[PDB]
Symmetry: C4
Subunit: 249 residues, 4 copies
């Protein structure tokens, strides 16, 4: 349907999806750069990053944001999730598209507002996702794939709809999945599992080194997610030709 | 209405809001100062603050307190939240006012009971909020603004009332928002996102250096919250003139 | 009532309350002593205790145990909680009594099973609660009082019964209250807020130095809890003489 | 019943139970090895493992996985849990069996996919469970027994079915039980409380030193679990001969 305020609701989503991504990145990357703050106009040694601190920053950002606007847009805030839904035929490409853009832009916008907030920092990488020393790049992409997979998979089961056994908070569970991802990937690849988030940093930093692994890995994981839930473990009893109909509306 | 025990309930709130703030500050700042405790009448080096420990101390204090008296007063415990509700026209100024005072006083009272509990500590700052070395003050206030924003925004969506899709604990979600805030702001500004909490420490310590950023930043974030939820993402279909009516009762 | 299996249910509680305390202490103190394990028949320096690790160990033990047997006995596992209920006239002294004993014994039993598990440790204090260097003993008891207070208060509101606005898990909330307590008191007094738990260690270690503060402090906090919830913030509209009736059955 | 798609559902479980174990181990052991990553073709000192990071990695993996496929197979992902259910006569041996195999294999498969992901690591133990220096082996098995016990016990109470007082998320609670286990056992035995998980590492590493303690300990704890819940604290009013019937179907 493309009439009356069916226009409104839609744009409100895209917009909520756009504003929410700003808070997400600002808060999360904002938390990650916080350890570089022993600063006092000097330059002697440095502090050790806290992986729990960062993983919770990202995960709780999502739990909170999903709780704050999840009813308005579905609180995707991540192309790997959106793409996950799309292939599940639960969303329209018009949506996927407009959303993934609101996402990358919000990231780009947020990652760029931090540059000013934390300008006073040296080799300010702005939390750019980079293959860590010792991680066999490429084959080191099994990390992003599994990290995004488990996430998208959680999102599909949590919004399955045929279920009546869910208990507790959908947001919190999805958020903990997001923290679970970083508890796994922070060390290896700095954890991306979210194309728009990786993208936002690599642009405001013009560093796109291997940046491709942060799209192919999640988008793949999403693919494995939709394949495993929708066809192996929890299949719909309807035919493909009809699911596809969702592609338009 | 201003009759019968409509007086009682009201004062019970203010009071619960006042007592709850005491536990809040005592527990939280109480946790933050705990790392300074390697003490043994000596003075050699010192321990490194734990940001997860502190962020959870604050967040769980709220989750717990919101659970303990949230039904009695709404468990605001924070002018930025109260102010957030007020502008949303969900509360009366008589309330906002009496509450924000119960808040600052509880802080002031709590921050002052700790002085005795932890008197045996050196440069006892009593967890006073201070711009960290390297944070471009002022423009370093985007931290408090975002930190309080995301919080107040969560509180507005969580108590939206038109919703029937909330699942899990409202308290816990709000509490995690409060921990999310510190996971972001502890390093930069010591995290305030709560005027009364900052205020309580700066008074029992007579240090009001830049203390203004801890009111303008949250109160602003609250403003951005109410603007984004009430007018951009989740608008009420009623007119302003009628919402305003709430200003009195 | 004291007929039929009203005997059974009762004893099943006491017993569940007794068995659950064993797991509690074993797991929690078990976690706390774990950092002393760099051991290799040598004796060079030592590791720094993790306060989040310990606070979660205790809190999640409770969340889990309250979830596992909370329907059977109410999952008190703590004289300060039991005593809290008793004064609230929600339990019978026959219960309070039989329970507090199942508690101290379980502690005593558990604290004593660890002695063997961790015998290979040096100055094995078995997690005994001790006033930390720098904490003005006595006036340093405001810690246990606030720590137990906030806890018991959460338990009273969470089982209030007149409420229909609770959402999420009662166990988890109470558990997080228990973790909140340690995030506050670990540094100062090693955190007790639970007479039976302190007691269990001080007996298998014959160290009762100031051990009194771990009964007077919590039991007091409980008192402040029942006073604040039952008479100031959430009063019952019934008279005292009738509540007292509960003292017997 | 062994007709129609009663075959399908069954295999879908086994399979979901098999795929879910892969993500579990990959993510969790994946997180545990992450601290060994300061690597830069050098070899100077090393980082200190984070026990909260690891405990949450395991626990949230379960919370997430139980949420993702718990409706399909029950999300056991652990012989000690399965075995726990079996003895409770809530599952068929045909199930227990096919499941425990899907488990060990998934572990074996996962533990083997990491070998490649983290090949670039030195004495890559692949998170193999080993008795820590100072832990009186054997009598040091009280750890695995208690760790698995508390877990299985939580799973039995959480799926009790006669209950109508559960609140919140069953998955999250079980997940926190899994994190609780590691907060206790990581230091002592590297925490197993899950035969298939220990097994998976010891095979891809051909190190089976004491590996027996990781079966006898959990399987025992499970036994103590089913004994305590099903016969001491929460008994069914039916006779044994009829429960046994479940052994077949
Ligand atoms: C339904 C059948 C499911 C089978 C699942 C087993 C998949 C095994 C593939 O492992 C992959 O090996 C690559 C190197 O060859 C790595 O680069 C990659 O990161 C890793 O993931
Ligand atoms: C509707 C939002 C559209 C956002 C478009 C972003 C395009 C990419 C350029 O980003 C810019 O990067 C600069 C630093 O390099 C910042 O100083 C500047 O402020 C920021 O804008
Ligand atoms: C189905 C959705 C597909 C989305 C594809 C968008 C990928 C993002 C593009 O990254 C680009 O990579 C180039 C190197 O390859 C860089 O030179 C360029 O500056 C950078 O912007
Ligand atoms: C509906 C439109 C929403 C647009 C949101 C983008 C806002 C960009 C403003 O960034 C602000 O820049 C200041 C310096 O100029 C910083 O001091 C301040 O902390 C930072 O927040
Ligand atoms: C109904 C509660 C009213 C509280 C009013 C507080 C006013 C500010 C003064 O605080 C005082 O600071 C002293 C340390 O400087 C403490 O020694 C003293 O105990 C504390 O009271
Ligand atoms: C709409 C709500 C407005 C609340 C305004 C209260 C602000 C708190 C006042 O702080 C004051 O700042 C001064 C410096 O400017 C200090 O000299 C003074 O000692 C300190 O108390
Ligand atoms: C309804 C009125 C509530 C008033 C609450 C304020 C209580 C102030 C008491 O502080 C107490 O001061 C003692 C030293 O004098 C400390 O030893 C003790 O630990 C500390 O808690
Ligand atoms: C029904 C349970 C009753 C428990 C009574 C406990 C009384 C206190 C003595 O504890 C004992 O301490 C010894 C170490 O000092 C341990 O070696 C011994 O095993 C343990 O029993
Ligand atoms: C209303 C409930 C009251 C419970 C009271 C029980 C308190 C526990 C007793 O501790 C005792 O303290 C003595 C020193 O004072 C020690 O010498 C003795 O060995 C030790 O066992
Ligand atoms: C219903 C009655 C329940 C009684 C529970 C008390 C059990 C005491 C057994 O302790 C066990 O002692 C062994 C050494 O002898 C240790 O190797 C083992 O790890 C430890 O667990
Ligand atoms: C249906 C899944 C069946 C899995 C059977 C696993 C048998 C045990 C052998 O594991 C193998 O270990 C090698 C390293 O030693 C890996 O290089 C190889 O890839 C992996 O397969
Ligand atoms: C009721 C379920 C019983 C499951 C029993 C399976 C136990 C796993 C076998 O471990 C084996 O231990 C041997 C040493 O004893 C090793 O030599 C051998 O390589 C290793 O594979």
């Amino acid at each position: 349907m493309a009439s009356e305020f069916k226009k409104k609701l839609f744009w409100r989503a895209v917009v909520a999806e756009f504003l929410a991504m700003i808070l997400f990145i600002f808060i999360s990357i904002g938390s990650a750069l916080g350890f570089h703050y022993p600063i006092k106009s000097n330059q002697t040694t440095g502090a050790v990053q806290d992986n729990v601190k960062v993983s919770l920053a990202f995960g709780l950002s999502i739990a909170t944001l999903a709780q704050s606007v999840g009813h308005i847009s579905g609180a995707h805030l991540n192309p790997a999730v959106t793409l996950g839904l799309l292939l599940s035929c639960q969303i329209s490409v018009l949506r996927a598209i407009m959303y993934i853009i609101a996402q990358c832009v919000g990231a780009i916008v947020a990652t760029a507002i931090l540059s000013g907030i934390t300008s006073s920092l040296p080799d300010n990488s702005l939390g750019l996702n980079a293959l860590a020393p010792g991680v066999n790049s490429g084959q080191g992409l099994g990390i992003e794939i599994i990290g995004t997979l488990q996430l998208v998979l959680c999102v599909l089961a949590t919004t399955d709809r045929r279920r009546r056994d869910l208990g507790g908070s959908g947001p919190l569970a999805i958020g903990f999945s997001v923290a679970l991802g970083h508890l796994l990937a922070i060390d290896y690849t700095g954890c991306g599992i979210n194309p728009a988030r990786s993208f936002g940093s690599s642009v405001i930093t013009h560093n796109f080194q291997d940046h491709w692994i942060f799209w192919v890995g999640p988008f793949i994981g999403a693919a494995l997610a939709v394949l495993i839930y929708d066809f192996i473990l929890a299949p719909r009893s309807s035919d493909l030709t009809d699911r596809v109909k969702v592609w338009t509306s």
